[model samples]
Target chain A: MCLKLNLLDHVFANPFMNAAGVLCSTEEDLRCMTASSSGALVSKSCTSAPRDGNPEPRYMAFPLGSINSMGLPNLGFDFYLKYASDLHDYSKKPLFLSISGLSVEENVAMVRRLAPVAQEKGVLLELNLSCPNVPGKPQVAYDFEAMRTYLQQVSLAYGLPFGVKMPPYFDIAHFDTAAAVLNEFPLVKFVTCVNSVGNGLVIDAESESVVIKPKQGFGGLGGKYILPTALANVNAFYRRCPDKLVFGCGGVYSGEDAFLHILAGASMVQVGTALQEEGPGIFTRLEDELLEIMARKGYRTLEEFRGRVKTI
Target chain B: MCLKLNLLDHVFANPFMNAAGVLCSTEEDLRCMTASSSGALVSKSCTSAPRDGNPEPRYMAFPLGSINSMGLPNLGFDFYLKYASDLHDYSKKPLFLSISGLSVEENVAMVRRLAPVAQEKGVLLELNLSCPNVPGKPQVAYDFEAMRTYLQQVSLAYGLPFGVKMPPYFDIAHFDTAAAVLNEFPLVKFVTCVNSVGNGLVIDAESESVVIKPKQGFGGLGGKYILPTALANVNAFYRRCPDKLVFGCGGVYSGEDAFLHILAGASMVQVGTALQEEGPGIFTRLEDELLEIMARKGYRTLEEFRGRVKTI
Candidate 1:
């Protein structure tokens, strides 16, 4: 059995990787991921400058999943760009830089200044358009016109193929509308299914209080709680946009989840809460379980079953 | 240990009920629910006239949850109006009439004609503003201005207090915006937290095909797949709309789920997929488990812990 996968022109040794904003906050964590069995690694969602983000108790991990209001905490664009330019080794594995600017102009500025340089350094870009925990900021993907303008300006400035991280949409009209907007931009080659189930409130039964401390204890939800919504988004865009690729993120803890994501149309599956809980070592176990599932089903490769969910 | 609840001066024996569009689609189902341990029962959302809904295979049950594109299938407004007028027994349990008009004018017309009659018969009205499976019609709540206008006209025509069934919102800004809109109408007394995780696709793995026939296999997702989202919406609106009561819907199958909903500030918790799967008999088990959990926690009444989730 093989877990080999391909995205754009790159072939990955396996389909598993860390979802952006998980273990990519610091250089040490990024290095650990690069050395792990994961096929790809991503940088923390970065703004133009360093941010302290929300206060303490901002993230909490539980048996079912996790929640966080990190508010795009990062060391800024320059640091990640330098890291990508100096450390990325495409021959070893692909490195993706995630950018979540505070404003449209800032996003355009970042892309204009760093996209070409990062491209030269063999790094891919993933525009983080859905950060729901940002205090006063609306997720760029929620406003259709804003999303269109942002994508247009960034595409023009970057002049390179990139991907987008989207929030889960509950409407069929939204799927149609968002896909229409993405299809208009050929440079938008890939669509990552979801960011997180944003602004969820997790309460402690004993304390009768919220678990996190930011924005009145509201934060983004991940883990088993998001699998169905994640799979829906991945498959929705996969069916709606034939010219684009789809990556699955959310609620993935094991190979069964990985297989489900691929079966729903994702070329790659990302780990967030699970990675945060179990660390990078989970990649090996996930690979083994996925391969075992494939072998048990008499399958030899991921492509044989990817995006082939049955109906009756 | 009393589980009794109050809504708009009426007392309910317990907080368990079926969400609109679940088992209350027919007279038989409605009668069965009224005879069960449920404190209340709601009618299926009805249009001005009969609708066959989407094609067959419109609904499928799964281990995690269920999906449906029923498209508001019902006998019609007259049928439910007749039932509420003649068949409903308020002495036994409260009855709610759920209305989902095809257009704003139609909604106004339905409210204008039925509100007085329903009010006289002691039937409550729950206007469903989110129906994602309708092909050409948009979910009324998604369009802010449209929602405002619809509520304004309906409120004027009905001249009475009614509740609204809402879709789950992922953004905090959305919660603020939606709550502000609802606050504008004092007659909108209660807000139903969600109406399925709308437009979710469920597939059959072995056959590699979609499970439902409507909108190319797209339908609203319900059951455990939506618990976190359901809790989020319930708590969001509960905190934001202090003047309005919240009815929790989505992903409720057990006593723990029911308890979570109340702790998140829901006055009542409604079941959908679970009721469809297990039938009304599940209500007895839910109530028993809820009582046991309450006893173990040393709480005697629902109000003691309702809306008291703590943060630290």
Candidate 2:
């Protein structure tokens, strides 16, 4: 049975960071994304301390999608305190802070510190468990042990609900195991199934060099190409563990795509890749289009047919 | 009775010129606007010779519209001819040449010189009879004696199916006067109704200055604002003189708007401002939207409802 959902209820109150490292450098970007109806404003993934991140040529566009290798360069917790406070004051969307750590202790401390701020600000927090560039880590959120440990520890440290973001690797069957494990923790409110696809590299034969080169020759892919996979994973989660809420966060450009994610069983969605094409005007247009679609489809609210996918 | 016409048929053959002076600068822009969509091209408005247009702030935007004051800047006929030979190579959308001469003789001479080049390139020619910014040319197309003299002389001099672009300032009552004037000359193949609203400016209170200053604060209003006015003039021309072919040009941004222009009285519609917002993608989308509207309305071809305003 399809669960009823009110999509308007899920509209983020502010724009959140895409955890895209150094890309969220200005206030202009924050205002642009969160100015409309997005429900949660997520901060870019921050690390234990401040880091400059990778050098230039961090992003590139292709006909199908874009590739980026922005290593998680963020200001330390002190900088985050200021950034989060600014986001709290200026943004209408609730905060969903993203964090990264080198160790369990560090991760737990990060959550403990952010919990009070998030609680005071009435914001949510998200633990980014699936960054592909960082080495020595399990590489994706489906790494059951690491993701579960992070979720449990972070949940214990924070007083408020926290969520997890998963990476959309080529195989998604393992995601079922990860979801089952996370379901054990009631504090983990939801899971954003799928981040950018990792280790995607395009080589320019004319230059005989990798177009996106970091310390290694690999990065992540986002935008239209990954939407089908993202939708599929969200669908899988709905079928396997409907109780655990899911946030679809990849390749969303229009309301139709967002609505499709809802039908596929996502409780909410986040957008980043497509923003590169639509710009800030996208938010207003998306809201307008979604409303138009709802009216046309005879859907009075988002809940009318949430997770209501019917097979032909 | 409504005329049975295919507006696209005329567009597919007629040449066009970009009306705004500052909007066209290099050969590339001329090529872009005049480039064959299986039609002839019109270069941007050029004077008897090259003239630098008004200074910046050159453009401003509102919630639904835009205004620009670019003193019609042109790189004289000599510079245009420098690349005239290169134009001959383009066969897709035939290059229809557009020229604006200061005096009657100058207009005659300009067309005479370009006529041979247009013929060599398999392109048509359009003469901008009177530009809004040019001093002392009455802003309407029905300036009988002056327009008739120019058309008769141009036809005698160039042997081309010449068209005149009229300012959008005239009302329905003036249509008869305009039609009577146009009726005197069978050599005039068509009329392009409506140019941008002349000399529009947007002031920025925060900056405490005018946003764009062109021709001492005269800019043309383009986009959605001009649609109704353009439609009225086009319908008037068709009603006044059914035999004279008319090409509709103004705030046509979508296929619906284009289709309406056809149904209201135009044989075809021309686009300028909407292209500013949507870019090259507008053409395909407009065609798709028009087909959908046509199919739903039960009209198959452009002829069945060209100016069938009663159904509307």
lDDT of 1 by residue, B1-312 (tens): 889988877889999999999889788988999999998999999999999998898989988889898988899999999899988788999998999998889999899888778668778899999998898776889988989998998999999989999988889889989999999999999999989878777765445577898777778888877777888899989988998999999888988888888999999899999999999998899899889889999999998988877766
Best candidate, lDDT-wise? Answer: 1
Q: For candidate 1, lDDT tens digit of each residue in A1-312?
A: 567777777879998889999899888888888999999998999999999899888999877788899988899899998888886666778888899999989899888878667667758889999998889998889999999999999998999999999999988778889999999999999999989888877776657677889887888889877877788899899989999999999889988888888889899899999999999999999999989888878889887888887644
Off by over 4 Å in 1: A292-302, A310-312, B296-300
Backbone clashes, candidate 2: 30
State every prediction's TM-score relative to the real structure: 0.95, 0.47
Two-chain DockQ for each candidate model: 0.58, 0.01
lDDT to native, each model: 0.88, 0.60
For residues B215-254, write the lDDT of model 2, one tens digit per residue.
3333556665455446656766666667667777776766
Query: Ten consecutive residues with minimal summed lDDT in candidate 2 chain B?
Result: B1-10
Query: Can you write out model 2's per-residue Cα lDDT over A119-158, one digit (the tens) per residue?
Result: 5665566777777665444453544677667777777787
